[PDB]
Design a protein around this ligand. Structure first.
Ligand SMILES: [Zn+2]
Lengths: 96, 158, 263, 346
RNA sequence: GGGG
DNA sequence: TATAATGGGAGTCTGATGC
DNA sequence: GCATCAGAGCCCTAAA
């Protein structure tokens, strides 16, 4: 909303449009650097004011929320590599 | 707060990973309050409702328990037998995984008994300790419904 | 015997005693075993035929039952009843789930797959599909029962001071609080040896509290904050629906570097 | 299917006690406690440990757990060992074991027979922030307390004594758990008092009282400032999921910015400030910048004073309090040219 | 509740 | 901590699928 | 057959 200085909602149907165009990098920007990828949005802003190109995005924070919310439901959600080894998307912060 | 413990003995990043002795808080990024899980240790186990109420029940199908049966055990309406220990009810032996009501469980577990109010002042037609048949007359207005040892409760006159 | 020294009935001299005019007569299905000397079993013990009761082994029990030691009548009663193990709740189910050999049940269900009437084969398949899921996955069925309940990190259920100094808080905090209260009260009721009616009431309430936390409204009345009809928003409500995590923050998002105006 | 109705049916399965039976059970409970006291002397054990062991065998094998305060983990081995020491007593001593057992059994029945009393008390406390069953269970907790403290000799009926303990237990429950932000029980009492007072004041005045009118009504110690501070403390939080409007869309939480995590601008600024800060201490010299850098600490917060500074700068100790001035002074001249740090003053 |  | 007190109050229409 | 469940378009504004 305008009163909160809000961003526009790029909703399910808007994502579909970008998919049908095959605009993979525009869509990925929408899903990460222009929203909840915190490292990405911070890093992209820093690049633009320095004249560099925007960096490759990282994990959207709302995916981390989904993972933690599924754990609260006692479901173990694991990101895996091609070797089926776990990949830690919390970068060591949530493991003892 | 980022890299700052609760009581404020260790307030900056030279210590990262230290756990303050006084207040017990790790010095790291405050972002971890989005990540680290806690837990509650239940005293008695509780079923996860998804594996109960999502039809056909996953627990119910594995154990061959209907929707109604699984409800009755989980929500404390009916017993389920793990080890009958030779019990028998209404003449047939109790088989493991049988559902018992509360009355059925009490008859099996604690035995069967009944108490009859002798009209006040009326003296009993039977004596304390004596074995009794069903139908035997205990007092002018009192007839016993079951076999067993009759027991005096509160003698008014000694 | 009585409250005060007077009103006691003391025997004047030698005599024999008779009991008359009882308030009620209690008929118990039990066996009576009188004993002259010391009795070796105390009251409450459970007993099987042949077990020694009193007098160094002379008197023993005939029936299966629960020991009642009468110090007035000088008799050891054994009330006919069994040592049966029958349970209620998730603890019973967790045991039966632990006591599953999934390999065996597969074998049995495969043999059942060899049967006419079509309906028999249909049900054994559905069962066999759950069995095979657990077998292939490596998940133990008793994990569908919770012992430790996870707690979501606090920044995902925040308590924040809004503009006015007022506090705003997530519904999950209240669902957890109900749970914690009931768990703590249950621990206390157990240590203090409450009767089974009370412990049972507490246990079923604990189940409902877990149920509201995970999926509120799914079974039974939705838990609400006091003086509002609004169902509290549980973990299931957060994930699912148009407003859920998937269709609101995941398959679509609000974005930076965007604007809108009239065309 | 209805949790209240189910419980009401189960309590109705225990008949109420006659005056004789009520006194009998109460009598046996008291005698049993005395028996456990005596059994402690004879045996050299702990009265609570004995009591839990007695109680364990009465309730059966079903309930066995560690009890907070008991010296031994109360597992089937210890309850067998300790029970065997109790059963090793001579006939005149061993009778106290039978008494204790019969005491615990009677306690159970007494509690069970009064559950309907708790319901009738709890039903009156609905609507204060605890659900009906929560009120019943807390009421049941008081009933347990009443059975342990009851003196049957005083000839009062049990319902009379219990009611005090049950009411007490529910009221402590309402005061303790009803608030998301927990408030000390005495403070809840003051707040509740403040409420009642305003209700009186408004009923005679035909309008809301001011803070001053309540402060007067509350007596000495109270001014309007204190009435206001107390109401601020009594404010309960509001749900982030409270709907704005009636449609299901938009929640109150959706209108709340996150003030904790730095914004892209803020993150950028902190990086830029650190970058000009080091790129400023080295253009005079890295070393007099090294003495100074140690004094504040970049990501350390190494601010104390004269003492500690005894160590590794490179000089002894008063001198650093000068190169600190010379560090700050050399920084100050060079700054007017590279006046780029002025804008970070906001 | 209005706008497309 | 002691008269006695003992069982609650309240409110559309679709199609798909498991008893 | 009949009950129980989970579905029922998108973006935006303002009011709370
Ligand atoms: Zn600290």
């Amino acid at each position: 909303g305008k009163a909160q200085f809000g961003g526009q909602r790029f909703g399910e149907m808007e994502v579909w449009a970008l998919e049908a165009y095959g605009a993979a990098h525009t869509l990925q920007e929408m899903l990460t650097l222009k929203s909840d990828d915190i490292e990405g949005r911070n890093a992209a802003y820093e690049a633009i004011i320095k004249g560099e190109d925007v960096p490759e995005p990282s994990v959207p924070e709302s995916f981390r929320v989904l993972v933690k919310e599924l754990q609260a439901l006692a479901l173990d959600v694991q990101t895996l590599d091609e070797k089926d080894n776990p990949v830690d998307i919390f970068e060591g912060l949530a493991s003892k | 707060k980022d890299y700052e413990c609760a009581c404020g003995k260790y307030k900056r990043q030279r210590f990262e990973g230290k756990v303050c002795e006084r207040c017990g808080v790790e010095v790291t990024k405050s972002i971890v309050r989005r990540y680290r899980m806690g837990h509650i240790e239940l005293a008695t186990p509780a079923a996860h409702i998804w594996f109960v109420k999502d039809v056909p029940s996953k627990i119910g199908t594995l154990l061959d328990l209907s929707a109604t049966e699984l409800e009755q055990v989980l929500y404390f309406s009916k017993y389920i037998v793990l080890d009958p220990k030779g019990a028998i009810l209404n003449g047939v032996p109790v088989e493991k995984r049988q559902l018992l009501t509360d009355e059925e469980y009490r008859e099996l577990r604690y035995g069967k008994q009944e108490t009859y109010p002798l009209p006040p002042g009326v003296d009993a037609l039977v004596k304390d300790g004596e074995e009794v048949v069903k139908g035997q007359e205990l007092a002018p207005g009192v007839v016993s419904r079951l076999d067993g040892v009759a027991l005096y409760r509160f003698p008014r006159r000694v | 015997a009585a409250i005060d020294p007077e009103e006691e009935v003391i025997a004047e001299a030698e005599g024999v005693v008779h009991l008359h005019e009882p308030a009620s007569i209690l008929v118990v299905k039990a066996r009576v075993y009188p004993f002259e000397d010391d009795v070796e079993v105390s009251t409450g013990d459970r007993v099987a035929p042949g077990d020694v009761l009193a007098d160094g082994g002379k008197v023993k029990s005939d029936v299966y039952g629960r020991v009642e030691v009468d110090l007035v009548r000088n008799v050891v009663r054994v009330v006919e009843s069994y040592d049966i193990d029958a349970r209620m709740g998730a603890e019973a189910i967790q045991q039966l789930l632990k006591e599953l050999d999934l390999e065996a049940l597969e074998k049995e269900l495969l043999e059942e797959m060899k049967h006419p009437s079509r309906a028999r084969r249909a049900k054994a398949r559905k069962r066999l599909e759950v069995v095979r899921a657990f077998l292939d996955s490596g998940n133990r069925p008793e994990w569908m029962i919770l012992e430790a309940v996870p707690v979501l990190p606090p920044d995902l259920r925040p308590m924040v001071q809004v503009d006015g100094g007022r506090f705003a808080t997530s519904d999950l905090n209240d669902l957890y609080r109900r749970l914690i209260n009931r768990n703590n009260r249950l621990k206390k009721l157990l240590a203090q040896g409450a009767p089974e009616i009370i412990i049972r009431n507490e246990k079923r309430m604990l189940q409902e509290a877990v149920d509201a936390l995970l999926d509120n409204g799914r079974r039974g009345a939705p838990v609400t904050n006091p003086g509002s009809d609004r169902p509290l928003r549980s973990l299931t409500d957060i994930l699912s629906g148009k407003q859920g995590r998937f269709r609101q923050n995941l398959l679509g998002k609000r974005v930076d570097y965007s604007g809108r105006s009239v065309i | 299917s209805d949790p209240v109705r189910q419980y009401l049916h189960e309590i109705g399965q225990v008949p109420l006690l006659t005056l004789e039976e009520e006194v009998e059970l109460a009598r046996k409970v008291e005698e049993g406690m005395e028996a456990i006291k005596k059994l402690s002397e004879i045996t050299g054990l702990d009265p609570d440990l004995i009591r839990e062991v007695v109680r364990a065998k009465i309730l059966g094998s079903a309930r066995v757990r560690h009890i907070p305060g008991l010296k031994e983990t109360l597992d089937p081995k210890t309850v067998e060992e300790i029970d065997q020491k109790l059963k090793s007593l001579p006939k005149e001593h061993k009778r106290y074991l039978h008494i204790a057992r019969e005491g615990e059994a009677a306690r159970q029945h007494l509690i069970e027979a009064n559950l309907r009393l708790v319901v009738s008390i709890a039903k009156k406390y609905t609507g204060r922030g605890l659900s009906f069953l929560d009120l019943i269970q807390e009421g049941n907790q008081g009933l347990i307390r009443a059975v342990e403290k009851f003196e049957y000799k005083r000839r009062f009926k049990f319902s009379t004594y219990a009611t005090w303990w049950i009411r007490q237990a529910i009221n402590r429950a309402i005061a303790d758990q009803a608030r998301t932000i927990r408030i000390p029980v005495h403070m809840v009492e003051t707040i509740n008092k403040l409420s009642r007072t305003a209700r009186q004041l408004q009923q005679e005045l035909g309008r809301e009282p001011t803070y001053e009118e309540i402060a007067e009504a509350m007596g000495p110690g109270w001014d309007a400032k204190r009435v206001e501070e107390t109401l601020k403390i009594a404010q309960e939080p509001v749900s982030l999921e409270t709907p704005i409007g009636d449609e299901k869309d938009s929640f109150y939480g959706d209108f709340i910015p996150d003030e904790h995590l730095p914004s892209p601008v803020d993150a950028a600024t902190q990086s830029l400030l650190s970058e000009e800060l080091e790129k400023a201490l080295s253009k005079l010299s890295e070393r007099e910048a090294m003495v100074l850098k140690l004094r504040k600490g970049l990501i350390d917060g190494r601010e104390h004073t004269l003492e500690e500074v005894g160590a590794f700068f490179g000089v002894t100790r008063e001198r650093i309090r000068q190169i600190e001035n010379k560090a700050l002074r050399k920084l100050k001249y060079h700054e007017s040219r590279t006046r780029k740090l002025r804008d970070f003053l906001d």
